[PDB]
CSV table of C-alpha atoms in Angstrom, one decimal:
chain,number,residue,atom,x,y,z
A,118,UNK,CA,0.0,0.0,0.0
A,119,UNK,CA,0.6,3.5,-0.6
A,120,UNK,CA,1.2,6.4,2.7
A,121,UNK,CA,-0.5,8.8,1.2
A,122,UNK,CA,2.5,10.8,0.1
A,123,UNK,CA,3.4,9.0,-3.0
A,124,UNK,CA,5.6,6.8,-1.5
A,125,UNK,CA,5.6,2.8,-0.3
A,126,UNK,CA,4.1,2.5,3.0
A,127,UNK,CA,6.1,1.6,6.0
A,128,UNK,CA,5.4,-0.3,9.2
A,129,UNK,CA,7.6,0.5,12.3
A,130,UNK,CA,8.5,-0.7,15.8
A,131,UNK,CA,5.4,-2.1,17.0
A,132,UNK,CA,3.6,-2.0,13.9
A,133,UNK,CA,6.6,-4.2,12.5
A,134,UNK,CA,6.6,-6.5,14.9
A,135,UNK,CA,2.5,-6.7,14.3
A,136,UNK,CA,2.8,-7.4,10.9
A,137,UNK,CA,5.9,-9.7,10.8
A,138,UNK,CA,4.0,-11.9,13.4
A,139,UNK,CA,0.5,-11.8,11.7
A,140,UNK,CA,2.5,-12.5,8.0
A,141,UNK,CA,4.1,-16.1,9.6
A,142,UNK,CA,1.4,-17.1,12.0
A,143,UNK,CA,-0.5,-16.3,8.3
A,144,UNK,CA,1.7,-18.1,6.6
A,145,UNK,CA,1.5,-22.3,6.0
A,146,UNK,CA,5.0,-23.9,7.1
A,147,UNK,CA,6.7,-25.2,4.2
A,148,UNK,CA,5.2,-22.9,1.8
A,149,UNK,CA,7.8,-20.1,1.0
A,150,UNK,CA,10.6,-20.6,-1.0
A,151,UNK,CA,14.1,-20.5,0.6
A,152,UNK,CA,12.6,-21.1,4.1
A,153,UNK,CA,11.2,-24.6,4.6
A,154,UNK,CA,10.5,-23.9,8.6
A,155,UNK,CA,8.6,-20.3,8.0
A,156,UNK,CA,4.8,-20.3,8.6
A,157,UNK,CA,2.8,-22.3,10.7
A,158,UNK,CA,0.7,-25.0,10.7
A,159,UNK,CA,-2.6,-23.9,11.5
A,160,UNK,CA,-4.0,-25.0,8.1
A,161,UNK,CA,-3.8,-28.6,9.3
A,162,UNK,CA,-5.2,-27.8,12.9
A,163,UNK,CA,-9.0,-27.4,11.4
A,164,UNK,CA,-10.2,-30.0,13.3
A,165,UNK,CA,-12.7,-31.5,15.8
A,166,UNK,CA,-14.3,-29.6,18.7
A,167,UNK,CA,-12.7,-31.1,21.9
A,168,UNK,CA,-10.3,-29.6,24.4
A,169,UNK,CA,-7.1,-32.1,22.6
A,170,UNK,CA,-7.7,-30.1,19.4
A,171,UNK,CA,-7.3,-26.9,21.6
A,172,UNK,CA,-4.6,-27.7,22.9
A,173,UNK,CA,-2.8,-28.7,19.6
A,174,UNK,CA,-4.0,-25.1,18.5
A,175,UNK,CA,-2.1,-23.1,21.1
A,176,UNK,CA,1.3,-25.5,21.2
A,177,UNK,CA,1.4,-24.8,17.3
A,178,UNK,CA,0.3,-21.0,18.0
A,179,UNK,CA,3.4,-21.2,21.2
A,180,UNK,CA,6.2,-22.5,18.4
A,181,UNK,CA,5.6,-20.1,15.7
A,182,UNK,CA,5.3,-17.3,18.0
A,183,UNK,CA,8.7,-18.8,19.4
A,184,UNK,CA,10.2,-19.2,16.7
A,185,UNK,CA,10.5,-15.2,16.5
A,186,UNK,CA,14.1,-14.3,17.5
A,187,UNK,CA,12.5,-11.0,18.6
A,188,UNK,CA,9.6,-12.8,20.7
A,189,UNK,CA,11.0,-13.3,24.3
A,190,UNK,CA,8.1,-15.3,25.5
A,191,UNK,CA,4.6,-16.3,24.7
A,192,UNK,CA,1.8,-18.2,26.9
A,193,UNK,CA,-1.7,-18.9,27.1
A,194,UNK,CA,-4.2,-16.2,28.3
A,195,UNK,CA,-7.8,-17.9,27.5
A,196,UNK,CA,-9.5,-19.8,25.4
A,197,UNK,CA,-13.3,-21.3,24.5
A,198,UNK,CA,-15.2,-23.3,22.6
A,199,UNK,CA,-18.7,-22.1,21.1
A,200,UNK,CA,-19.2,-25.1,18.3
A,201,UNK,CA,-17.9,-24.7,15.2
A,202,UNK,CA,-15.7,-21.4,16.5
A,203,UNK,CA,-12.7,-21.3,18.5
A,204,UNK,CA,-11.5,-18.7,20.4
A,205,UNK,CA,-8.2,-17.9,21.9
A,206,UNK,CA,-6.0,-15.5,22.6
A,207,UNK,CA,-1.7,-15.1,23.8
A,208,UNK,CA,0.1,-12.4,25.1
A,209,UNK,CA,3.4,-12.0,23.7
A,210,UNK,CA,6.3,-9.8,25.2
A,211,UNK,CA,9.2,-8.7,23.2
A,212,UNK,CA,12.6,-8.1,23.9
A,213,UNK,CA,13.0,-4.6,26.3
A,214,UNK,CA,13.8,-1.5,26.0
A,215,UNK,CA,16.8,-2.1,27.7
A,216,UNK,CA,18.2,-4.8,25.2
A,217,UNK,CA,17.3,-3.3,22.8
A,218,UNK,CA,19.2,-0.1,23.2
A,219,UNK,CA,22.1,-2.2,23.9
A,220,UNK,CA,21.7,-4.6,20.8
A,221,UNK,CA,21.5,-1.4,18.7
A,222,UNK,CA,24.1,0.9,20.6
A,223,UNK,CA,26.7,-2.2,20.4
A,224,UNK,CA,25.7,-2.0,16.1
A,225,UNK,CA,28.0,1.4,16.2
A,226,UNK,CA,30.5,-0.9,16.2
A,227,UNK,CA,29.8,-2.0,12.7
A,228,UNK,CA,27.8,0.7,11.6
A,229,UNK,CA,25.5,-2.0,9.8
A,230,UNK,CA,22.1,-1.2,11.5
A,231,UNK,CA,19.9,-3.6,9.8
A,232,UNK,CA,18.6,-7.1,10.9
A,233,UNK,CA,19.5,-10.2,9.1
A,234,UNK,CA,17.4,-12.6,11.8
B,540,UNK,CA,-36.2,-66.9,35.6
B,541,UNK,CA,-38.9,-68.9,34.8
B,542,UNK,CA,-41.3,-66.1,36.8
B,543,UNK,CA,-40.4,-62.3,37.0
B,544,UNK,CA,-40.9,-62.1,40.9
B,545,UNK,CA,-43.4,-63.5,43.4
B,546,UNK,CA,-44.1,-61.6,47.1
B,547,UNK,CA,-43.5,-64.5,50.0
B,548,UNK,CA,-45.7,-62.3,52.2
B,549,UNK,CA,-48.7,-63.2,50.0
B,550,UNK,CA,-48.1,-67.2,50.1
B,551,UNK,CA,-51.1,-68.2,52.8
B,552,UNK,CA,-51.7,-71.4,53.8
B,553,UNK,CA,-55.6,-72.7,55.0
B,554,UNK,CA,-55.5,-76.6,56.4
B,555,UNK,CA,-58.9,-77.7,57.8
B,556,UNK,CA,-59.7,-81.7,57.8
B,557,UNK,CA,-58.9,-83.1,54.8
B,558,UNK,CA,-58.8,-79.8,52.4
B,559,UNK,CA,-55.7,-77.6,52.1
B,560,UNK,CA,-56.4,-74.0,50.7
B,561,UNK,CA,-53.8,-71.7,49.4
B,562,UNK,CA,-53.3,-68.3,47.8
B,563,UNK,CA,-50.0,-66.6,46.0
B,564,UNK,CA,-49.3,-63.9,44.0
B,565,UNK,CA,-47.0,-64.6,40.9
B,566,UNK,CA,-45.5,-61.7,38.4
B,567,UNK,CA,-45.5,-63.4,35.4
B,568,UNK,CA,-42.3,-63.8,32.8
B,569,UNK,CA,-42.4,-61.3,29.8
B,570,UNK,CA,-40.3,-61.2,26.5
B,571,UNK,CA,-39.6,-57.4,24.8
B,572,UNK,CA,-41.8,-56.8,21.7
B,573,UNK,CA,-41.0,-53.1,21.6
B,574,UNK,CA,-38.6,-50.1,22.4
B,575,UNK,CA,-39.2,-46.5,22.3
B,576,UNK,CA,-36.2,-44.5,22.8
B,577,UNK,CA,-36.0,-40.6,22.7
B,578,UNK,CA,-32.5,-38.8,22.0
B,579,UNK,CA,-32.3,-34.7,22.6
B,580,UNK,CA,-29.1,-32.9,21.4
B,581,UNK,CA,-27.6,-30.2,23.6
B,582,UNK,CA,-25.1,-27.3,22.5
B,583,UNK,CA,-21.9,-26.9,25.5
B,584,UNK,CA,-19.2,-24.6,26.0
B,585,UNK,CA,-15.7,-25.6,27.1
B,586,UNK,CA,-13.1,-23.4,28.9
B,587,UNK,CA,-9.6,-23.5,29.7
């Protein structure tokens, strides 16, 4: 998309870290080229409505959040069944201010300031 | 289970002379000829 100032739209700091997450939970695992362990799973996961499927949901949903260099830490909040709809959510807490300053301050070093995670 | 049940309370015995007189009770055996069953579905919610 477009900013409104001619130019390619950006997403930054939080709204990075919103998309990049959204994009691979999105994405199917195996699916993009170059990266066979990008994506997730949840394609496979549309099954029955019992608590084992549930739980299958949200240890996929705890790997690919995981699997985020970024992503300190992620756990189950709540979840529910209502039929055919489930519902869940995570909380998800990345890295601190404080490391981060540090990771990017100790960059001077090299001067590269970019991210090859 | 030749019988479904009898009461023992019931089983009376009359001796006078030479005639005995007796009354009982008996439930007698059946065999199933028919079923009627009734099935309702629910909806549930699950949490954590």
């Amino acid at each position: 998309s477009t900013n409104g100032n001619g130019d390619l739209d950006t997403v930054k700091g939080i709204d990075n870290m919103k998309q990049q997450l959204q994009a691979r939970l999105l994405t199917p695992r195996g699916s993009l080229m170059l990266h066979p362990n990008y994506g997730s799973d949840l394609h496979n996961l549309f099954g029955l409505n019992i608590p084992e499927q549930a739980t299958l949901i949200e240890m996929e949903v705890l790997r690919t959040l995981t699997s985020d260099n970024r992503v300190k830490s992620a756990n189950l909040i709540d979840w529910k069944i209502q039929g055919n709809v489930y519902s869940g959510q995570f909380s998800v807490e990345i890295k601190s201010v404080e490391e981060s300053i540090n990771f990017v301050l100790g960059q001077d070093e090299e001067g590269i300031f970019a991210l090859f995670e | 289970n030749e019988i479904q049940d009898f009461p023992a309370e019931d089983v009376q015995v009359i001796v006078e002379g030479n005639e005995a007189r007796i009354s009982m009770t008996v439930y007698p055996i059946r065999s199933f000829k028919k079923i009627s069953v009734s099935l309702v579905y629910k909806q549930q919610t699950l949490q954590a």
